[PDB]
Design a protein around this ligand. Structure first.
Ligand SMILES: CN1CN([C@@H]2O[C@H](COP(=O)(O)OP(=O)(O)OP(=O)(O)O)[C@@H](O)[C@H]2O)c2nc(N)[nH]c(=O)c21
Lengths: 16, 187
């Protein structure tokens, strides 16, 4: 399964 | 047409679709009428594609009227009648005003990041903005699966910052269908 923690998800907000 | 992650993007476990609805309370509502009042906003396949929609969307706390956002796995309609939802149900949480926008963000990040760990069971999440409260819901496939519904309840407690004494309620969609002093006028 592809799992992401909240912090990682938020870190991706600033990339296209 | 088919949505795929871009070259360097971070793929998700599933593609998802945002939906929006606005109506008034108490409408005589068939399947076909309900489906006409809900609309697809956009579908995404990567974390970056998610943020492209989400960073440009009105926050649910800023919506006017009896309105909802739904975020469901691609191919699942946010309706009881959908094959994925027919035997299913939802956890609902009722919130005073001012809490839904943060709760919704936490919920959908947990959902997309596969924090629930109930295999294929998650169908989608809803945030519903109403007259004097908001409701956040998460739908799963099999209402009778007690291990699954318990795991979902505990995960919500883990990922959401809820006020003390927040009631969580589980409603099977089949119970919802057959559910009926003064008539409720403002909601
Ligand atoms: C998810 N829903 C909701 N719904 C019916 O359509 C009406 C409007 O939905 P809603 O705006 O979510 O209901 P709401 O007024 O917030 O309150 P409640 O859910 O307590 O009825 C309600 O009477 C509801 O029972 C539905 N009707 C059909 N046929 N299929 C569906 O999937 C759904």
């Amino acid at each position: 399964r592809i799992i992401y923690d909240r912090k990682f998800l938020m870190e991706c907000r600033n990339s296209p | 047409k088919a949505v795929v992650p871009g070259p360097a993007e971070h793929p998700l476990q599933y593609n998802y679709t945002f939906w929006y609805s606005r109506r008034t309370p108490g409408r005589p509502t068939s399947s076909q009428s309900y489906e006409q009042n809900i609309k697809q906003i956009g579908t995404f396949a990567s974390v970056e594609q998610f943020w492209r929609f989400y960073s440009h969307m009105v926050r649910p706390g800023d919506l006017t009227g009896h309105s909802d956002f739904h975020l469901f796995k691609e191919g699942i309609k946010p309706m009881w009648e959908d094959d994925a939802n027919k035997n299913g149900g939802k956890w609902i949480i009722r919130l005073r005003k001012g809490l839904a926008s943060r709760c919704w963000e936490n919920l959908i990040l947990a959902m997309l990041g596969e924090q629930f760990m109930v295999g294929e069971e998650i169908c989608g999440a809803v945030v519903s903005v109403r007259f004097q409260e908001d409701i956040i819901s998460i739908w799963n496939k099999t209402a009778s699966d007690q291990a699954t519904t318990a795991r979902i309840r505990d995960t919500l407690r883990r990922v959401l910052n809820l006020p003390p004494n927040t009631i969580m309620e589980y409603k099977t969609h089949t119970d919802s269908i057959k559910m009926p002093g003064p008539q409720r006028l403002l909601f």
